[PDB]
Amino acid sequence: MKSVITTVVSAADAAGRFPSNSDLESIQGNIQRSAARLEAAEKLAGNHEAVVKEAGDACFAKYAYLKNPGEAGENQEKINKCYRDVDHYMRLVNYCLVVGGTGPLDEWGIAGAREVYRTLNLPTSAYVASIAYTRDRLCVPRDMSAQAGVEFSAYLDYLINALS
Amino acid sequence: MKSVITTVVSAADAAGRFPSNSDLESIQGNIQRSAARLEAAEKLAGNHEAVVKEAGDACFAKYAYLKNPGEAGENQEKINKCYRDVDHYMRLVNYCLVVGGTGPLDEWGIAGAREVYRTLNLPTSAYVASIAYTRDRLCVPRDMSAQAGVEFSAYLDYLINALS
Amino acid sequence: MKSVITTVVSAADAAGRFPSNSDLESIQGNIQRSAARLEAAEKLAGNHEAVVKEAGDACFAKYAYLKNPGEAGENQEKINKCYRDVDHYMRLVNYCLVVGGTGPLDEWGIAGAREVYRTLNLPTSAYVASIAYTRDRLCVPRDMSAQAGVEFSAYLDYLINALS
Amino acid sequence: MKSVITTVVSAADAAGRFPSNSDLESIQGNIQRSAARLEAAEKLAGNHEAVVKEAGDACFAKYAYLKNPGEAGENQEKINKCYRDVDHYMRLVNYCLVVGGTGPLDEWGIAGAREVYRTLNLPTSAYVASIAYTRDRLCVPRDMSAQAGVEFSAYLDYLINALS
Amino acid sequence: MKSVITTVVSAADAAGRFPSNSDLESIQGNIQRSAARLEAAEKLAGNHEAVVKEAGDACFAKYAYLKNPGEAGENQEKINKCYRDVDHYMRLVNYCLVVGGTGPLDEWGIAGAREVYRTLNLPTSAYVASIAYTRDRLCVPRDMSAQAGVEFSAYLDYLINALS
Amino acid sequence: MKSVITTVVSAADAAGRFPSNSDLESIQGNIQRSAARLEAAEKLAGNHEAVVKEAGDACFAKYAYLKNPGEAGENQEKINKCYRDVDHYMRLVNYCLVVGGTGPLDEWGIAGAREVYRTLNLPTSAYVASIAYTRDRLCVPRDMSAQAGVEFSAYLDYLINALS
Amino acid sequence: MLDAFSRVVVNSDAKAAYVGGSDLQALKSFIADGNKRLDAVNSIVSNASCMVSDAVSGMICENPGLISPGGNCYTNRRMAACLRDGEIILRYVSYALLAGDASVLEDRCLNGLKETYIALGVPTNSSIRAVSIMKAQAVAFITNTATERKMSFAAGDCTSLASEVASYFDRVGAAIS
Amino acid sequence: MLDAFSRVVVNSDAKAAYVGGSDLQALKSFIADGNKRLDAVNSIVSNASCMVSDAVSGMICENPGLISPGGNCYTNRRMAACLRDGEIILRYVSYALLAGDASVLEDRCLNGLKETYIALGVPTNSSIRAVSIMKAQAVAFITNTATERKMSFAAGDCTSLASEVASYFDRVGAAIS
Amino acid sequence: MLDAFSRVVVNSDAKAAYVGGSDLQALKSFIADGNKRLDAVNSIVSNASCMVSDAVSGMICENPGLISPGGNCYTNRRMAACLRDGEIILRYVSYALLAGDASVLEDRCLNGLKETYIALGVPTNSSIRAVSIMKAQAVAFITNTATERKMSFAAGDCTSLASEVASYFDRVGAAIS
Amino acid sequence: MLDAFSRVVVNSDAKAAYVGGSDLQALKSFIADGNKRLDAVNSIVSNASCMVSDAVSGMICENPGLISPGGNCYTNRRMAACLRDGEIILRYVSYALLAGDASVLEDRCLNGLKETYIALGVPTNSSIRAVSIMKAQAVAFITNTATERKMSFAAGDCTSLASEVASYFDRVGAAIS
Amino acid sequence: MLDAFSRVVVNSDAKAAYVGGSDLQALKSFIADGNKRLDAVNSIVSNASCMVSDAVSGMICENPGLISPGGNCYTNRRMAACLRDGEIILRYVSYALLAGDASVLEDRCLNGLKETYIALGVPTNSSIRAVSIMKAQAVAFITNTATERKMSFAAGDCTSLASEVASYFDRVGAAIS
Amino acid sequence: MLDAFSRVVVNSDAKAAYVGGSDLQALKSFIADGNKRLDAVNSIVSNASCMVSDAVSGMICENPGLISPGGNCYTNRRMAACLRDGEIILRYVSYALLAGDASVLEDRCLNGLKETYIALGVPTNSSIRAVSIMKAQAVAFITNTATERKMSFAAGDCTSLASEVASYFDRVGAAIS
């Protein structure tokens, strides 16, 4: 799982090294930045149901052609899986904010996603609409502090860039 | 040259990745810890002649045998090379404190040292005596702050362990 | 460039072999099947403007959203690039029918297409709509013989599966 | 076993490909050439005993020194193994004509043959005499059709070239 | 070129080693055994025309078939090349006796010989006949000392085994 | 175990070769040099206790600082292990003289020795003093013949060079 | 790998027998019906993407726990691996149908798959359902009885080819059970 | 590779000189401006897909010959390689900005790139135009003056960081010109 | 590998749960006490050479047959391998203490070690004594109760870190017994 | 590698042009003359051992210095390498004739052969003589006019196929001259 | 690998003992009789080709089913592999006789051979007959009692060397039974 | 690689000439002087660590700029590489003296060393001084005239062996000048 700690430990292990000063100094970075990302995680944890509804709503508002025959939101069951997926991604963003790294998105949401969405004919622009709507919906400091919003926004952009 | 920055950049490069949040968070540790190690670097830069004199003197005090014909310190020019070497190491400790990692010791001081000291019949115990005497001679808070002292000590201990 | 000939020559080369009976026998299939696919190639060469117009029109008919600001077909120059791309693909289908293999589609049409369409935000569903509409629009025996139609269909289906 | 089918399937498998048009077109070559090679196989199957006697006979007629002490046909048991070997090769030629490929000769008769004949001091010119006599004995269309004789002759030449 | 010296030097080099006692001790065997093999080399150098004449004559005596049209010795120029080849081999045996190893036979006589004799239809039995006749014709003590004869025989047997 | 025999056999095995003349010639070197090295081995076997006492004695005579606190001969138990080690090395020199090769020293005394002596802070100059004293103590032909002393001295120098 | 022709040759070689007229009536018929076999393989490879996605989607909609946490299609990484395996298995079955022999499927695909799935924790029972759905698809395409697509063929009967492709699909579940 | 700090150390070691208070003012300022540099790097990485897409599309709309036959972006394979090269260059420029030193860019990206592009027939002039568009985008994002997207920052001067990234982009064109 | 944070995320992912305030009090405390954890790791890595040589020397002085002929530390080659293994094990334990999770130690060091030592004839009972001596050393260094060295710390209590490093040492003997 | 057909496609793609009836007459003739091309290739491959043996022996009897000491065919090792090179060249010429295009020959055989022969001291002039003898043999076999062996063909004109193979042999001498 | 000398050293090292006069009478005799041992190895390696072909031919003429279909020497590929194995085994036996120790044969040839032959279906009983024929050949050559060849030796007795080479041949069947 | 004997063979093969009594006098003398050559090689290998240490230290005390910053022996890494190169050169010179031929030195050491040193910035002039000091040491040891150590030899003339080793050292400086 990519994090501050796993990066420096994996680098030490590649070189057969004990932890040294630059490794401790990196982890001091955790202590400093953690307050901001944990605030983002807690806010997301407490309000994900409402965030996810707005996100899925924006997707189907932008791309009404999804609800047509043979398309990806053609029945209520397929629409429900669309909201579930947006929830899945917001739960991985929550995890990224707790770990302090992209590892949860990387391993559990992005790896294989191009192959899956291509094979199941799920348009990536639909996912990007949901994620970008959430990114742009963010209101600071109404919804969280400035630097919690910087952390949250950074993972949302990371996911958009990974789908593009 | 191993530092906080080169470690996370090197890891990003091996995976073909842009910098991401754990990389930035690592480098924030740079910001937090820099005052302590630059304090130690400036003190060592300001007083290295005096530190080196004490360290070389401690070597020859412990190992009078070095001055015997055949031995590593048999004449005044060889003794002067010994104090030069201790100054070389203290200069690399200054560099490690500026970089915030072991890179300068590793590249310019430790790599090949075993081969060199073995081949030229320079006893590793003498070098350890000079470094250990300097670590033990450090006086907090007389010489520097506690956390400057931890940074200084860490690099002296790193070198001792590298020679052992 | 994958064809009957290059496949058996490439296999002979990897084993350091002269051509032998199975190689010659493979190429005899070339002789048998050529009339059907050159029939399909000449028909497509003779009428590609009309075929491409119908295919692009079918794309925009199915996905009116493409014409919306931000979308792939937001202005007339982008719409004209879309019909150009469909013509590019139909020209590679003509080439596959002349070569008697997927080489021209594989090398000049499919390799890198996933990266390109992902990066420029061109929905793969639109391209599939144009190709599928052309496959479904084929009229045997109005447009060509049954076996010309099988050859034409096979390359359109190959491209659809490559995009899916 | 090298054949039209195994060549194109092994090529598809190397590239992770489904069968495509050039592979089907190669196998259409089977359907076209099969009549000629199956006629050769059936004629050989029905008359191999008489073919093999003429072949072994020609070998010992050309190379009477084989029947001398310490040489390869020095007793009746060794002469009998010589005819058996010629039979073995004609049975592999029969198999090549059925498979439509050199695979049976390659795997069961040629691979290792240089090592065996060298170690057992069996002169390859003796085998070539038997095979070339059979090749040159062929009378078309007395013994088979023109293109059955082309198929038969091609495997006999393949074997001669493999021994030379 | 395989000899006592090149074997132990090559082994020292592969391990990055200076010569050591087993290497020097090996080369002392050089000193002990040299008289016997230089005796054999000088005898062969002194009388090679006579030896080669007997060896080629023995070839054609055993295999009169060689003189038949189509065969390896069908005309006088081909017969003269055969005696030349036997002289080439006896010259390489002289070299092996000077070097004290199989290097000259291995490099200049044996490597590629199987491919050459197979491709030009030169029966290996004829070459073995010439070499074997020479080994069997050796007369100790008429021609050389017992241990010169062992050295000479060893290289003739080495070549026979290389051709078998 | 490196010896004349294992060197030539390992070389033959690398090349898939039977033993040949240069290999037998190397082993004839054994027969020639064995008398000298076996005399050295027997003399060492019969007097190692007195040789080892002089050797350890010379080490502590040269390097009295060893008997100081925190140094390698600081108590009687550590001094006793020092003599034991010198005995270990003389027993491996005995083995080298019997095998006719460095293999026993290489495998059982040198491999890992730099790592062990570095980690346990045992100065290599102390071992070299013991070995060089023994080398220089040697009196020919009082203690052994000229060429037994050449063999003995060669292994002692081999060990000194391996520690330097 | 063997094809329908080299299979006969291997069986004949075991008896040191020449392949004669007596032996060739299956192979001459194999050749006679060869156009049907090319059509059958074309009908599969032309719809292979849809077959795999529909079959894996069907395995999941009947057993939704496969996409719950701890489920073996949970995460995009696992769903992609499963879709890849569906495509690999269909590709080897299509080679077996093109060659008229199971050896390429058994040798290159099925040999070691059971032990691998057990090691990875890939549910073999769910794998067998995915394969059974692809078997029903392929039988429909070969016999031009798919509900959602028709393709173009000369009038005749491909029931033997449909039975044969089914036998290759059945070997997958026999291997991994 | 070196960073802003090990660059100073390399310059000092050349004179066998300790790094002292005199020499550290730039480095103490580098540290004090550290949050801005982390923001600058975030502003680029957060928009990196759009930058590359837009920069390469831009190079093409200005020189539509690149996508004619015999053009170097003709075919999907070539276009994908070009977009890949735009992303690689932008990646190494972002490393250089994070490190405050060009060495990772010069050593791992630009070393031997001119020779590669020459061998491949990659037009170095068109490449430089793509890079100049990414320079224009990067300066706009660092200074929060992009026309189509603003991001969140405490107000302050980032002129130096914009000047520095522009200098890294300029090295690419310098290396392959 | 996992760290204290990704361990929590893995446990939450098994329940398809978001990590909320309810869940974060261990991790916020982990962060609060982070300076102590850095000091603990520093206290080990600063004395690692002495720890390994003293521990292996102690295993040998209690069981001198280890350095007799047929003994598994006999010859410099074997003593060097054993010292290397002591250093490797301590390095993996130090990573586990830095990360607040055993996964790097279990995955990269302990997985396959028992089977390896059995194959090589490395005595696991003597290995466990070496490790128990390093456990006592590390607990002394972390709590600044070593007899032969003191190091520099702000006043407080590291008993939880000492208990945690002991648990990582104990996993080594659990693996190889 | 390209064949007669993908060569036409490459030329057309250079003009973004469909291949139509105008362009196909050569290719329809290539197809109609296909059995003759299969016969031509059979006539060469069926005699390939004798061609190489005879061509290299020929180069030598005309220039007996090649087998003197310091000659490049002196020793069995050198002679075997030369016969190997004759067989390789003949193999790639036979591929070119099967394909109706020189690309496999130019790209996989002739690319860098001059530079190799230069480095090795392989006489390019003697090589060209060996190749000219194989050209003479190949034309004789394709036209069934070899003095020492006739093969079985339906009577017809193979002039074009003889001219083409001669053009492939001529490229070898062109590449290494 | 060990030789007669290093075998003694290994046995002495197990007792931490110096090799003294007491211990050396076998090795001094080994050296005294060394010329006989060189002659013995020469007598084998000079006839090795004939030994292997005669032994494999003998195994087959006593058990002709080995060359019937399904037989493990059927096909030239299998007969060549079997002849290769006969040569490999004889080469390792000759090394053991040159060194006066079985370790090279046991370590490099026999370790893993039984498991390999069982895996491949190589009949171990027939392998042991081939080896027993080579044992009889080698004993005849060493003692100059072969019927079809005499070689040249100083008068004396090599019965100990013949017994020793027999013991090395016997280890092959002990390994694979 | 060649030795004194295979060098004669290579010269003779160039004239297709047997080596006879005329040609063997040098080689019979090489054999008769063999014990001296083994002694010469022993005198160098037995002092090889001191030679390299002293030769490289010598190069430095005469040119102390080599260990200034930007010097090529500055840092432990560089000094270790230089001492390594001194030992490698001395190793290949000792092989040449053992063999009585320079080929192992020219082919495996000196081939491409000038180009390497040029690329690396290794000063070829300082290298030649190190090699000239090792030449001076080697001649002193072969002739037992070293000032600080004598070894044991039967008295005799080793002038030729000293001249030969000096000629090998001289080739190094010739190759990299």
XYZ file of N, CA and C in Angstrom, chain I residues 20-131:
336
model
N -14.179 6.361 9.994
C -14.737 7.572 10.618
C -14.091 7.898 11.951
N -14.484 9.030 12.553
C -14.041 9.469 13.889
C -13.995 8.305 14.860
N -15.072 7.527 14.930
C -15.196 6.324 15.795
C -13.904 5.508 15.738
N -13.310 5.399 14.539
C -12.279 4.393 14.177
C -10.859 4.945 14.365
N -10.703 6.266 14.501
C -9.417 6.971 14.248
C -8.631 7.286 15.528
N -9.079 6.853 16.704
C -8.488 7.364 17.967
C -7.134 6.687 18.192
N -6.984 5.415 17.795
C -5.687 4.701 17.755
C -4.729 5.438 16.809
N -5.159 5.753 15.587
C -4.274 6.400 14.579
C -3.923 7.826 15.002
N -4.869 8.645 15.477
C -4.526 9.998 15.989
C -3.498 9.913 17.132
N -3.614 8.930 18.031
C -2.641 8.653 19.122
C -1.305 8.192 18.537
N -1.327 7.248 17.576
C -0.117 6.827 16.819
C 0.646 8.074 16.340
N -0.065 9.053 15.766
C 0.527 10.318 15.236
C 1.035 11.156 16.421
N 0.217 11.305 17.476
C 0.549 12.104 18.686
C 1.872 11.631 19.289
N 2.106 10.313 19.255
C 3.256 9.657 19.916
C 4.327 9.381 18.864
N 4.146 9.882 17.645
C 5.074 9.611 16.532
C 6.508 10.006 16.833
N 6.760 11.097 17.557
C 8.157 11.502 17.855
C 8.836 10.418 18.678
N 8.113 9.833 19.644
C 8.659 8.725 20.469
C 9.053 7.555 19.576
N 8.257 7.278 18.537
C 8.458 6.092 17.655
C 9.719 6.326 16.812
N 9.890 7.543 16.314
C 11.132 7.906 15.588
C 12.352 7.775 16.496
N 12.264 8.259 17.726
C 13.353 8.081 18.704
C 13.617 6.596 18.900
N 12.573 5.768 19.029
C 12.773 4.319 19.312
C 13.561 3.682 18.176
N 13.188 4.018 16.939
C 13.824 3.383 15.761
C 15.256 3.892 15.693
N 15.452 5.171 15.967
C 16.817 5.749 15.957
C 17.681 5.001 16.982
N 17.119 4.644 18.148
C 17.919 4.081 19.258
C 18.412 2.687 18.863
N 17.636 1.982 18.042
C 17.995 0.637 17.500
C 19.043 0.815 16.384
N 18.749 1.632 15.375
C 19.548 1.625 14.127
C 20.936 2.198 14.457
N 21.026 3.140 15.397
C 22.290 3.732 15.919
C 23.198 2.706 16.618
N 22.659 1.585 17.133
C 23.443 0.548 17.848
C 23.338 -0.822 17.164
N 22.892 -0.887 15.906
C 22.546 -2.176 15.282
C 23.759 -3.097 15.150
N 24.936 -2.560 14.827
C 26.162 -3.385 14.622
C 26.495 -4.120 15.924
N 26.576 -3.358 17.002
C 26.910 -3.862 18.348
C 25.853 -4.884 18.764
N 24.573 -4.592 18.530
C 23.472 -5.525 18.904
C 23.689 -6.878 18.228
N 23.951 -6.889 16.935
C 24.033 -8.194 16.216
C 25.267 -8.968 16.699
N 26.421 -8.328 16.774
C 27.682 -9.028 17.154
C 27.584 -9.535 18.594
N 27.039 -8.724 19.482
C 26.846 -9.124 20.900
C 25.848 -10.287 20.979
N 24.779 -10.270 20.179
C 23.719 -11.308 20.300
C 24.244 -12.642 19.778
N 24.891 -12.625 18.613
C 25.453 -13.862 18.015
C 26.572 -14.352 18.955
N 27.394 -13.452 19.520
C 28.500 -13.847 20.430
C 27.904 -14.517 21.667
N 26.766 -14.004 22.152
C 26.047 -14.527 23.325
C 25.432 -15.900 23.068
N 24.797 -16.093 21.926
C 24.278 -17.409 21.495
C 25.429 -18.440 21.509
N 26.592 -18.048 20.996
C 27.789 -18.941 20.943
C 28.380 -19.164 22.345
N 28.519 -18.147 23.188
C 29.204 -18.384 24.494
C 28.345 -19.250 25.433
N 27.020 -19.260 25.256
C 26.095 -20.162 25.996
C 26.085 -21.569 25.395
N 26.364 -21.709 24.094
C 26.337 -23.008 23.378
C 27.588 -23.136 22.528
N 28.748 -23.368 23.169
C 30.005 -23.395 22.424
C 30.161 -24.466 21.331
N 29.343 -25.522 21.327
C 29.366 -26.570 20.292
C 29.018 -25.979 18.935
N 28.389 -24.796 18.900
C 28.042 -24.142 17.605
C 29.331 -23.835 16.835
N 30.474 -23.708 17.499
C 31.738 -23.336 16.806
C 32.733 -24.492 16.797
N 32.304 -25.705 17.167
C 33.088 -26.958 17.010
C 32.876 -27.493 15.597
N 33.791 -28.327 15.046
C 33.498 -29.045 13.800
C 32.089 -29.663 13.758
N 31.393 -29.520 12.629
C 29.999 -29.974 12.466
C 29.020 -28.999 13.110
N 29.534 -28.066 13.913
C 28.778 -26.950 14.476
C 28.400 -25.947 13.390
N 26.832 -25.236 13.593
C 26.435 -24.557 12.331
C 27.121 -23.193 12.246
N 28.127 -22.629 13.402
C 28.844 -21.394 13.138
C 30.326 -21.690 12.882
N 30.661 -22.940 12.575
C 32.063 -23.350 12.340
C 32.463 -22.903 10.938
N 33.681 -22.382 10.835
C 34.246 -21.687 9.639
C 33.774 -20.233 9.633
N 34.629 -19.391 9.081
C 34.317 -17.952 8.902
C 33.120 -17.802 7.932
N 32.970 -18.676 6.932
C 31.851 -18.606 5.969
C 30.545 -18.712 6.744
N 30.454 -19.625 7.713
C 29.174 -19.852 8.450
C 28.962 -18.747 9.479
N 30.007 -18.347 10.180
C 29.873 -17.257 11.166
C 29.429 -15.997 10.396
N 29.935 -15.781 9.176
C 29.554 -14.545 8.459
C 28.067 -14.636 8.089
N 27.603 -15.812 7.673
C 26.194 -15.995 7.237
C 25.260 -15.726 8.417
N 25.646 -16.227 9.570
C 24.861 -16.109 10.823
C 24.794 -14.630 11.228
N 25.936 -13.937 11.253
C 25.947 -12.473 11.520
C 25.069 -11.728 10.508
N 25.176 -12.059 9.224
C 24.288 -11.477 8.184
C 22.827 -11.726 8.574
N 22.473 -12.965 8.932
C 21.044 -13.248 9.266
C 20.612 -12.417 10.476
N 21.460 -12.267 11.497
C 21.129 -11.441 12.671
C 20.805 -10.014 12.244
N 21.640 -9.436 11.374
C 21.441 -8.072 10.833
C 20.140 -8.000 10.017
N 19.843 -9.006 9.188
C 18.641 -8.989 8.296
C 17.397 -8.962 9.199
N 17.400 -9.846 10.190
C 16.222 -9.988 11.071
C 16.037 -8.659 11.804
N 17.109 -8.087 12.372
C 16.995 -6.798 13.083
C 16.503 -5.706 12.151
N 16.944 -5.694 10.887
C 16.534 -4.669 9.903
C 15.021 -4.768 9.681
N 14.472 -5.965 9.453
C 13.014 -6.181 9.264
C 12.234 -5.817 10.539
N 12.724 -6.183 11.723
C 12.062 -5.771 12.988
C 12.021 -4.231 13.062
N 13.122 -3.548 12.723
C 13.170 -2.066 12.768
C 12.134 -1.471 11.780
N 11.960 -2.037 10.600
C 10.924 -1.587 9.634
C 9.526 -1.745 10.247
N 9.246 -2.895 10.878
C 7.958 -3.186 11.536
C 7.723 -2.128 12.608
N 8.739 -1.786 13.410
C 8.574 -0.734 14.459
C 8.367 0.634 13.817
N 9.032 0.925 12.697
C 8.849 2.235 12.040
C 7.418 2.353 11.495
N 6.845 1.253 10.977
C 5.519 1.226 10.305
C 4.359 0.965 11.273
N 4.652 0.490 12.493
C 3.613 0.079 13.443
C 2.787 -1.077 12.910
N 3.406 -1.989 12.168
C 2.747 -3.218 11.655
C 3.787 -4.272 11.292
N 3.475 -5.537 11.566
C 4.351 -6.715 11.356
C 4.397 -7.173 9.893
N 3.536 -6.685 8.992
C 3.434 -7.270 7.623
C 4.794 -7.298 6.901
N 5.619 -6.249 6.922
C 6.891 -6.307 6.146
C 7.756 -7.460 6.673
N 7.821 -7.641 7.998
C 8.618 -8.710 8.665
C 8.032 -10.062 8.249
N 6.705 -10.221 8.345
C 6.093 -11.542 8.049
C 6.259 -11.856 6.560
N 5.906 -10.921 5.673
C 5.869 -11.136 4.203
C 7.275 -11.371 3.631
N 8.256 -10.530 3.985
C 9.549 -10.420 3.269
C 10.658 -11.183 4.004
N 10.485 -11.469 5.288
C 11.572 -12.066 6.103
C 11.159 -13.451 6.591
N 10.010 -13.559 7.241
C 9.639 -14.808 7.964
C 8.961 -15.849 7.057
N 8.340 -15.438 5.950
C 7.603 -16.355 5.037
C 8.638 -17.205 4.301
N 8.773 -18.483 4.654
C 9.739 -19.381 3.993
C 11.030 -19.607 4.776
N 11.247 -18.892 5.883
C 12.500 -18.963 6.693
C 12.610 -20.320 7.412
N 11.518 -20.828 7.990
C 11.548 -22.123 8.737
C 11.991 -23.219 7.779
N 11.327 -23.304 6.631
C 11.567 -24.337 5.587
C 13.016 -24.203 5.116
N 13.504 -22.965 4.978
C 14.887 -22.681 4.549
C 15.859 -23.166 5.621
N 15.669 -22.786 6.866
C 16.622 -23.182 7.928
C 16.653 -24.718 8.033
N 15.490 -25.371 7.944
C 15.412 -26.863 8.017
C 16.231 -27.473 6.877
N 16.058 -26.961 5.659
C 16.799 -27.361 4.443
C 18.307 -27.187 4.665
N 18.741 -26.020 5.167
C 20.183 -25.705 5.342
C 20.775 -26.409 6.569
N 19.952 -26.822 7.530
C 20.408 -27.353 8.827
C 20.779 -26.243 9.803
N 20.221 -25.042 9.625
C 20.391 -23.929 10.598
C 19.561 -24.267 11.823
N 20.195 -24.376 13.003
C 19.489 -24.721 14.235
C 18.505 -23.605 14.610
N 17.196 -23.874 14.605
C 16.176 -22.827 14.892
C 16.225 -22.466 16.382
N 16.521 -23.432 17.241
C 16.560 -23.163 18.700
C 17.656 -22.128 18.998
N 18.856 -22.264 18.429
C 19.963 -21.299 18.628
C 19.581 -19.953 17.986
N 18.949 -19.981 16.809
C 18.471 -18.739 16.130
C 17.553 -17.965 17.087
N 16.606 -18.678 17.706
C 15.657 -18.043 18.659
C 16.402 -17.434 19.853
N 17.494 -18.029 20.343
C 18.266 -17.401 21.440
C 18.891 -16.073 20.964
N 19.496 -16.050 19.768
C 20.127 -14.842 19.202
C 19.089 -13.738 19.201
N 17.889 -14.041 18.692
C 16.754 -13.086 18.557
C 16.314 -12.602 19.948
